[PDB]
Amino acid sequence: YTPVVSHRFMASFIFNRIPDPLDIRFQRISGLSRELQVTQYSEGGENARNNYLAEKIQHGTLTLERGVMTVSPLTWMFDRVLSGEKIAYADVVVMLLNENSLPLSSWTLSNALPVRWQTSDFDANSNAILVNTLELRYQDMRWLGVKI
Amino acid sequence: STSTSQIAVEYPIPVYRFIVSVGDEKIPFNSVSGLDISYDTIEYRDGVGNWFKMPGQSQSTNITLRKGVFPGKTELFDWINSIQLNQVEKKDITISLTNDAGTELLMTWNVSNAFPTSLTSPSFDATSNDIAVQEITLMADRVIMQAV
Amino acid sequence: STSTSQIAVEYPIPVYRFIVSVGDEKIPFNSVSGLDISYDTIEYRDGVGNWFKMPGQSQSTNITLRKGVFPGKTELFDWINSIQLNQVEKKDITISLTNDAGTELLMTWNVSNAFPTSLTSPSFDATSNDIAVQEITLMADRVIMQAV
Amino acid sequence: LKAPGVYIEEDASLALSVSNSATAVPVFIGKFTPTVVDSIQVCTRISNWLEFTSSFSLAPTVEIVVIETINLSPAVEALRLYFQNGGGACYIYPLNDAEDELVLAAIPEVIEQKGDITLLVCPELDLD
Amino acid sequence: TTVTSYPGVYIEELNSLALSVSNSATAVPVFAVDEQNQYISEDNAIRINSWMDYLNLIGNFNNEDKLDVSVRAYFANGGGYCYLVKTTSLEKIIPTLDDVTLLVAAGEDIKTTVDVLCQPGKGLFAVFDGPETELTINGAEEAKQAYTATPFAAVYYPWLKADWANIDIPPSAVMAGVYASVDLSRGVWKAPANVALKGGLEPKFLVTDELQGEYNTGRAINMIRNFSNTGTTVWGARTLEDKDNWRYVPVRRLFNSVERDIKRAMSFAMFEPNNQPTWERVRAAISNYLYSLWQQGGLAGSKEEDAYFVQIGKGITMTQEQIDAGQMIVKVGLAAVRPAEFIILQFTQDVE
């Protein structure tokens, strides 16, 4: 039918089956890619058409940046795991939104491990928002709804 | 000594008398301008020298139609206010040069699916004798020109 | 032979008589201009040929309202002086075309959260009979147009 | 009918353009049958295809001679092709007999009385 | 339904609700209801928005009722909101009801009603059932003339059977789901044959091709039958009349889907000043509907002037005596697509 636009979205986190509804305001989210790795096997007298053998599926890496805000249960989670205290998992629910703020489709990203966390640079010469480019690696992705 | 029936079939028609029909309403505007049918061109030249020219993609259409404000009537704003995130109630515009009283149409322009952008509120200044005039710049597609 | 009560409901309204209310104050300005409601457009074309047009992001609003200087009153400067690093005291602007004396409003424009940029000091020259006139170019959002 | 609103109907008729011009006004003398008045108007002024259908037959005048050789009159069809190539407001002079001397000799007496004709056509096949 | 006292979670079970998804489309089957049904009142048309709303009405599901197995197979395939009208008052309620595009004989005999109800002026397209007994090549002249020859009806012979039902399932139940599932996917102009049946529906009687060669000519009886590659599918797209104007249901269903969307596209013209600026506002409200139907592939041809035409005007289509009677005569023409029924395969053995 008709396509949808890419500037309404919210992403909520699930810290140990306890939802996190304070941290849904993000600047951008990376867009979710998955890829089936493929080993090409060429053989014998068949030298006019390829022959591709499937392999394991390689999921992408989810980056999402936000303006730096007051400290929140999202920020206490990344600071806990990137200071070497506790390696813990967090589930991410990324959903599109309608005009009536209803979800079109949602991606649930099970057991996403927070990998890196990077702020923007200070500079005195230009005016811009300090952002928090924080990037986390998920190990499964289960698309759910209508209008994928 | 030409008669008034040869003037109505030979002489050209002037701009200063037209009616506009927005959807199912009739709103009296002051100046409608900017409707056209444009195409881009594709050139291909090769070797021995053949300068092939083909018309390519149809180019976009945004018309600009202008109206003084009235003390009770607020019609153009509730069309530029009706837009939430992704969709407007798209209407169709018919412009038509008329007779003196609107009993006849002489040539008609039809505009297919029109949604508004860029409503310009009037320019106030205490040194001008103008009428408070606002304009609306609605983007659309498929302007066709229909006789009678 | 139209009466003065049909003129007040049919005839359009002129620009030269309006009042501006900055926050809770009433400052008499000379020329207010530049308020509008703009949107950008998103096009999507695919294959067999479907030229989908949707309006996208709301575009920014900066209005420009102009005032002669007065010997005691220094009102626009202490708003452009009030800004330290990140925040101003944001006000709201209501513009409204009036009656002859300000006993009635005829159509009202409301501006939501306005902060000033670019106060322009007057242009002195010893060969001109002008009044020392300064202007302020305040950026804001959500201009709405309200009847009566 | 009897109630307001839309009335969809199928298997409609065919309509043409009007294409008015008062300089080349033809007159069609042929085998036509009137259906609405049948009586007095010896030739009728039509202006387009709709005044023809509102006054005439849309039916070819079948003519049989007894082993039988038959004849079908294309005067209704030949007038459809006049409105399809060009247009105009032709006078139509229905004439079925073409052997009564008292009617045939009064063709110029009625065709000068109207004072608008420039062309003179005959859409029939039969030599006699 | 359990009463709620404390704020929290309730773990109450409800065995075997047989739950289906809600669907939205533009095809609204009036379901004929036999008079011995109790959860219907006559001279009343109740509305069923989803399968949970029907199951709210009847309470619990049983596979004995000819209606209960009918609306399950409808919502399993296409969905969309349907009107349950009892048969003995169906002649009063369908002219009353707007949003009626197809009238479904659920399991009842409506052949006396369709002759007075379905008219050229209306916008219905009834569907009813073939015989529930086996019929052969020899009985091709007897059961064919048991129906009328109106072009506003289609007949599907092989009654269905499913594993979840006991009584045989009538095929006008599933064919109203198929008419609503194809119009959303491929549009109205594509044929509602050659599509699969969902919900575990299976035909009762096996049909050969040499049997179907006699029930396709004249007052045609479309048939559904299973194949080796895909399973059960619909295999007919012919209406009852065998003239070339209305021979295929996609032609008759497009012209019925056009008229219901023209008459709401130019319904603003009612009680407007009947002069010329009303007319060109009418011919332009039709012409950029038909162009939007033209670009989606609904009409045949290649240009927009071989595809359709809208011609109105004083003297073009309406007389002066039709103006002061309050009549606007509009002439619109269309050129729809015809499907490919036959494909023959010529097998030469000697390659050049």
UniProtKB/TrEMBL annotation, chain A:
InterPro entries: CHP02241 (IPR011747), Phage_T4_Gp19 (IPR010667). This is Phage tail protein. It comes from the Bacteria. NCBIfam families: conserved hypothetical phage tail region protein (TIGR02241). GO terms for molecular function: structural molecule activity. PANTHER family: CONSERVED HYPOTHETICAL PHAGE TAIL PROTEIN. It holds the Pfam family Phage_T4_gp19.
Automatic annotation (TrEMBL), chains B, C:
This is Conserved hypothetical phage tail region protein. Coiled coil: none annotated. It comes from the Bacteria. InterPro entries: CHP02241, Phage_T4_Gp19. Pfam families: Phage_T4_gp19 (PF06841). GO terms for molecular function: structural molecule activity. PANTHER family: CONSERVED HYPOTHETICAL PHAGE TAIL PROTEIN (PTHR38009:SF1). It comes from Photorhabdus asymbiotica subsp. asymbiotica (strain ATCC 43949 / 3105-77). NCBIfam families: conserved hypothetical phage tail region protein.
From TrEMBL, chain D:
It comes from the Bacteria. Belongs to the myoviridae tail sheath protein family. This is Phage tail sheath protein. The lineage of its organism: Bacteria, Pseudomonadati, Pseudomonadota, Gammaproteobacteria, Enterobacterales.
Automatic annotation (TrEMBL), chain E:
Residues 242-348 form the Tail sheath protein C-terminal domain. Residues 103-240 form the Tail sheath protein subtilisin-like domain. This is Phage tail sheath protein. Belongs to the myoviridae tail sheath protein family.
